[PDB]
Design a binder for this molecule. Structure first.
Ligand SMILES: OC[C@H]1O[C@H](O)[C@H](O)[C@@H](O)[C@@H]1O
Ligand SMILES: [Ca+2]
Length: 628
């Protein structure tokens, strides 16, 4: 029985330096040290570019340990897109570059890589062409992948050929067992033993499992134990002593657990119980092959903010294709984490997303400014992109006519890099990969869910007797229909003039009409508001601006002011809002209940500053945003 052992080491771009060092001391270093003392042990390893760059910077000696092991036949470098992008989600031309960059790093390490670790095992029958042009010969995918096609675990112990266009590529399957056995008391000896007599057993998983995961810090025993009649070799070695099984076509899948996360909240809940139920009735093992959930690509459906971010980098990637310096930036913005969310923080970790927006912005700072209308995120309606030498503002007429994007070319930060508070299927804790935790009351107390998307200049109408804690959480009574409703527009001399004719839906529906004349300025923007109510009524009009304060742990405040500053060192710059008529300001942290390995993640995704003004029949003022 043949055995292929390999690990996948990666750290997302933007991760904290200390997080990096930890992973290093916790597993990257130890693993390779223990590997060095078993000259017969061969590991198939893949280091991501962001990690290799950090290592090259902070721990050079480590790269020498690698050249050493490679030179003594203990390692085969597995490659992929340099910045860990999901190959299927970035332009065809970017893959070639992404792969080639890492392919070149490996060469400088002394190895001629022939294989690619499919990031997040997201597969689409089209990576074949790219991988082939990149000179890659085999891809590592999950056994699951073959199941969803028509095969059975029983016939998944050999590598196959998969094609598209007229080209083929070798696909290796990752046994689900091993990725759950290893690491955990050499039982693999049994599964391996029980493999009898080509035929391989392939194990490939995150290296963080070897020391960084929850108290995972067995190996030394596993190494000589493996080194009997078990023939353990390296991918490359295999694809020279054998030829793939035969041709088989794969479906758009990923590893099993993606099926649940990739589903929208409700379907994720539904799917989990369906899997629990089959298991309970002990029928999941004979039918699993026919049980499937969502597809990675649909996180752009599940998290709108991720979709916008993704479609914005696509526009820029094309506009910067032949611009080497700008291009490097756009390629960094393709680091996968931060675009989705499963078990790890992902899109819920501000610094991971602050890094994507940084690179999207740096890549386009020097391009030529141009205002343009178009359906950016593909929701069937058209945004308005106003841009000057200092900012890029993207307005969504069809949605409150609000500024959904305000990127600072100067700071390479997106002021609206915020997340709406959403309910995740795993927020439902019952019973009271396979660890869990209940929601502590201290959180339950502050756990609210938005019905509004969070942009800049969202217009509300509330009761003059409303409370901040009611608005803060979502227990308040929104009176107007101007937050999530469309506005008409007309391009102005330096911006857009929007307006809508909704109403202040209270005991009686007093038809209303809001007007905002937004125009970019050399230092931000300035919006001139006008709200005339048809019939007199006692109510408060409020303009909401969601800023991406990420490093300043803020708390709910209420105060009178005509002007005020926000200061997020390590976050957004230092901005200042300037009204021309003092108002009641309501400020509050946007807390998100997210999941991770450790446990629950209550994260400040931003901070809402909404200016309340009193109104009965007529109201006028001017909100000014100044970058400092
Ligand atoms: O996404 C969560 C994890 O799921 C599985 O454990 C995969 O092997 C690993 O690559 C991934 O990080
Ligand atoms: Ca649109």
């Amino acid at each position: 029985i043949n055995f292929i052992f390999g690990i996948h080491n990666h750290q997302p771009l933007g991760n904290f330096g200390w997080v990096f060092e930890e992973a290093y001391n916790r597993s990257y270093r130890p693993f390779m040290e223990i590997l060095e003392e078993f000259p017969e042990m061969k590991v198939n390893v893949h280091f991501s570019g962001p990690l290799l760059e950090w290592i090259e910077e902070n721990k050079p000696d480590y790269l020498d340990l690698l050249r050493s092991l490679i030179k003594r036949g203990q390692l085969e470098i597995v490659v992929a897109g340099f910045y860990e992008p999901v190959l299927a989600a970035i332009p065809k031309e970017d893959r070639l570059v992404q792969i080639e960059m890492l392919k070149d790093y490996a060469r400088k390490l002394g190895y001629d890589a022939k294989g690619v670790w499919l990031t997040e095992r997201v597969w689409q029958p089209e990576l074949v062409k790219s991988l082939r042009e990149a000179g890659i010969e085999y891809v590592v995918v999950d056994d699951y992948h073959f199941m969803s096609a028509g095969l059975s675990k029983e016939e998944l112990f050999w590598p196959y050929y998969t094609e598209d266009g007229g080209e083929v590529i070798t696909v290796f399957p990752i046994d689900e067992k091993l990725r759950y056995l290893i690491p955990f008391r050499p039982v693999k000896k049994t599964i391996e033993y029980l493999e009898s007599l080509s035929k391989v057993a392939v194990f490939h998983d995150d290296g963080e499992k070897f020391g960084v995961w929850p108290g995972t810090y067995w190996l030394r025993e596993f190494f000589d134990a493996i080194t009997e009649k078990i023939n353990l070799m390296t991918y490359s070695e295999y694809l020279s002593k054998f030829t793939p099984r035969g041709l088989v076509y794969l479906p758009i899948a990923s590893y099993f657990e993606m099926s649940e996360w990739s589903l929208p909240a409700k379907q994720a809940k539904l799917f989990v119980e369906f899997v629990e139920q089959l298991k309970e009735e002990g029928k999941f093992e004979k039918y699993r092959v026919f049980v499937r959930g969502g597809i990675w690509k649909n996180f752009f459906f599940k998290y709108p903010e991720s979709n916008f971010m993704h479609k914005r980098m696509l526009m820029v990637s094309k506009a910067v294709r032949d611009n080497p310096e700008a291009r490097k930036y756009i390629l960094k913005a393709q680091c996968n984490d931060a675009y989705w969310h499963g078990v790890f923080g992902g899109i819920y970790l501000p610094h991971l997303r602050r890094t994507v927006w940084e690179n999207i912005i740096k890549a386009q700072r020097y391009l030529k400014p141009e205002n343009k209308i178009l359906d950016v995120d593909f929701d069937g309606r058209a945004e308005i992109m106003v841009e000057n030498d200092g900012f890029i503002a993207t307005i969504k007429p069809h949605y409150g006519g609000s500024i959904f994007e305000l990127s600072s070319k100067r700071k390479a930060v997106n002021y609206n890099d915020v997340l709406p508070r959403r309910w995740e299927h795993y927020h439902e804790v019952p019973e009271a990969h396979e660890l869990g935790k209940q929601i502590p009351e201290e959180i339950r107390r502050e756990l609210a869910y938005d019905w509004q998307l969070r942009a800049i200049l969202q217009d509300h109408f509330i009761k003059p007797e409303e409370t901040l804690d009611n608005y803060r959480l979502v227990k308040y009574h929104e009176l107007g229909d101007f937050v999530n409703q469309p506005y008409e527009y007309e391009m102005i001399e330096n911006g857009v003039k929007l307006w809508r004719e909704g109403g202040v839906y209270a005991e009686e529906k007093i038809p209303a009409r809001v007007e905002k004349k937004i125009e970019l300025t050399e230092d931000g923007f300035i919006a001139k508001y006008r709200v005339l109510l048809e019939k007199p009524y006692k109510a408060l009009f409020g303009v909401e601006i969601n800023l991406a304060v990420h490093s300043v742990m803020e708390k709910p405040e209420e105060f009178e002011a005509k002007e005020f500053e926000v200061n997020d060192p390590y976050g957004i710059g230092k901005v200042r809002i300037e009204l021309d008529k003092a108002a009641k300001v309501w400020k509050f942290p946007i807390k998100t209940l997210s999941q991770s390995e450790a446990g629950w993640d209550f994260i400040q995704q931003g901070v809402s500053y909404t200016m309340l003004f009193p109104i009965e029949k007529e109201l006028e003022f001017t909100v000014r945003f100044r970058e400092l």
